[PDB]
Amino acid sequence: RSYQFWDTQPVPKLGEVVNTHGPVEPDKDNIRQEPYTLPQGFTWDALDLGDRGVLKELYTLLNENYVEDDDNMFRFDYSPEFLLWALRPPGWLPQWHCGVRVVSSRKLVGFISAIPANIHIYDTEKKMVEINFLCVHKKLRSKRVAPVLIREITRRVHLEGIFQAVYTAGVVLPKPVGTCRYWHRSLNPRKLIEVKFSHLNMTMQRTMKLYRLPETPKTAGLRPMETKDIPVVHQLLTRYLKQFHLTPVMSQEEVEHWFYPQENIIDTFVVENANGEVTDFLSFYTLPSTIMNHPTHKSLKAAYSFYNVHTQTPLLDLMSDALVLAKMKGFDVFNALDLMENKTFLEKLKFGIGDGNLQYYLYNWKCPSMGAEKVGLVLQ
Ligand SMILES: CCCCCCCCCCCCCC(=O)SCCNC(=O)CCNC(=O)[C@@H](O)C(C)(C)COP(=O)(O)OP(=O)(O)OC[C@H]1O[C@@H](n2cnc3c(N)ncnc32)[C@H](O)[C@@H]1OP(=O)(O)O
C-alpha cells in the first residue's frame, strides 16, 4: 500500500516500529513565501469567522460536505457557535482559517484549519498545532485538492515557527501513534432505532428499560462550572493528565475557553464537596448530526465525552451522572472514546462499541505508538 501524498511527508512509515523520540526532519530555516497553487478556477481565502456571513458559509460547507458515518446515513452538523468555540481559542490566527473559493461564484468549496496547542508527548512538551475541519466539497472530491490544503496549512504554520502537529482521522495513514474506538450510549433508544442509528433477543420495552436513567444525578455537590472554578479546574486537569502519554498542556486561559459552560456547545459540571472544595469534574461537548435524507427525524442530538477528572468521586459515578445530565438536556446519544481510563466504565454503563476507528497522528514527530489507555487528548 503506497501513499502518493503521505509518502512525501515527514511522518513514519506504516508497519515500522519506532524506538526513538524526536522530529522526522530538521526544522526549515527558510520557508516558501508564496501560497501553493490551486487548480484553475479556485482561489485561497482566509475566512474571518467573526463575520456572520462568512461563518455561515463555513457552517454550510461543513453541514453539507463534512464527516459522514461508514453507512452514509449521518453527517456532522457543527453549529456556527460551536465552530467559533473550536476555531477561535486563545492564540488563534486568521491565516490559519484557510478557505478555498470558486473564483467566479465565490462559493466556498474547501477548508482546513490550524489552532495552536502545547502538546505533551511522552517526555517532551512541544508547541504544535491541531489540524481540524479539513473538508473538500463533494463535487470536488478525488481531485487531489486535499494535499494542496495540507501543504498550504503546513506552510502557514511553518511561517509561525511551528514544526509539529497533531490530528485525528478515521482513515489509516502513515502512521498512527494511537488507535481509538468510539462507543455510544443510548439515551433515546426509540429514536435511535427508528432512524437506524442502532438496532434492536430484546423487545423495545426491554430496550427502553435497559437504557433508562435516573432523572437527577447522584453525586453530592455536582453543579455547573462557574468563573470561580477556573483555577481549580486547571489545577485538577493538569495533575490528572500527567498519567497519559499524549496530552494537551493548557494555560488557565485555555482552560477557561475549553471548559467554561456555553449552552449547546460545552457543558462542565464540578463536584463541590461538603468542605467547599472542588474535587472532580465532568465535561461533554454538543455535536448533532444530520440524519441524511430522512422525511421525519432531521437531526440526532449527540453529546461527546470531553475531559473527566476524578480525585474523590469514582469515575464510574461521574460518568453515570454525565449520562443523566445529557438525558436531561435532551441528547439522544452519549459518545465516548476508549482512551484515558474510559474502558473502566464503557461496558459497565451500557455503552455499545461503534463502527470504525479514530486514529491519532503526529506530523514530524517520531515516537513509539501507545495503547488507547495512554491517549489523553480529545479533539472537537
Ligand atoms: C507543522 C504543521 C503541519 C500541519 C499539517 C499536519 C497534517 C494534517 C493532515 C490533515 C488532517 C485532517 C484532520 C481532519 O480534519 S479529519 C476530517 C476529514 N474530513 C472529512 O472526512 C470530511 C468529508 N471528507 C472530505 O472532505 C475528504 O474526502 C477529504 C477532504 C478528507 C479528502 O479529500 P478527497 O477525498 O477529495 O481526496 P483528495 O483526492 O483531495 O486527496 C487524496 C489524498 O488525501 C488523503 N486523505 C484523505 N483523507 C484524509 C484525511 N482525513 N487526513 C489526511 N489525509 C487524508 C488520502 O490518503 C490521499 O493521500 P494519499 O493516500 O495519496 O497519500
Report the b/e string of 82-119 with b at 16+ CB within 10 A. Answer: bbbbbbbbebbbeebbbbbbeeeeeebbbbbbbbbbeb
DSSP 175-234: --SEEEEEEEEESSHHHHHHTTSS-----HHHHHHHT---SS--STTEEE--GGGHHHHH
Measured by CA distance, the residue closest to atom 61 of ligand 1 is 3
Give residue 124 CA to ligand 1 midpoint distance, Å: 27
The CA angle 223-226-229, to the nearest 5 degrees, is 95
CA–CA separation, 25 and 365 (whole Å): 8
Q: What sign does the dihedral 320-325-331-336 (CA atoms) show?
A: negative
Written as nine digits, the cell of 86 is: 473550536
Cell numbers linked to 176: 498512527
CB neighbours of 228 closer than 8 A, spacing ≥ 6? none
Rounded Cα gap, residues 162 and 200, in angstroms = 49
For position 145, which CATH number holds?
A: 3.40.630.170
d(CA 164, CA 175): 14
Encoded amino acid at 350, one letter: K
Report how far Cα 284 is from the mean position of its chain's Cα atoms.
11
| Whether residue 129 has its Cβ less than 6 Å from ligand 1 | yes
Q: Does residue 3 line the site of ligand 1, with CB under 6 A?
A: yes
Task: Give yes or no for a contact between 375 and 339, defined as CB atoms under 8 angstroms apart.
Answer: yes
Are 24 and 366 a contacting pair, CB within 8 Å? yes
By CB atoms closer than 10 A (0-12, 13-18, 19+), residue 62 is buried
Side chain identity, residue 73: M
**Torsion, Cα of 21, 119, 338, 362 (10° steps):** -50
Q: Is the CB of 102 under 6 A from ligand 1?
A: no
d(CA 339, CA 178): 9
| CA 50 to each of CA 43, 54, 88, 106, 182: distance values in angstroms, whole numbers, following the listed order | 21, 8, 9, 18, 32
Between strands 222-224 and 278-286, the pairing is: unpaired
Specify the amino acid at residue 293. N
Task: State how far the Cα of 288 lies from the Cα of 78, in Å rounded to an integer.
Answer: 7
- The answer to whether 153 and 131 have CB atoms below 8 angstroms apart is yes
Number of domains making up the chain: 1
Half-sphere exposure of 150 (CA within 13 A, CB side): 13
In DSSP terms, 101 is beta-bridged to: 43, 108
| Gap between the Cα atoms of 172 and 251, Å rounded | 32
b/e burial code for range 350-370 (CB count within 10 A of at least 16 → b): ebeebeebbbbbbbbbbbeeb
Q: How far apart are CA 130 and CA 5, in angstroms?
A: 20
Domain containing 158 equals 1-380
The set of cell numbers assigned to 3 is 501513499
How was it solved? X-ray
Instruction: List binding-site positions for tetradecanoyl-CoA.
Output: 4-6, 133-136, 142, 144-146
Bridge partners, residue 45, by sequence: 99
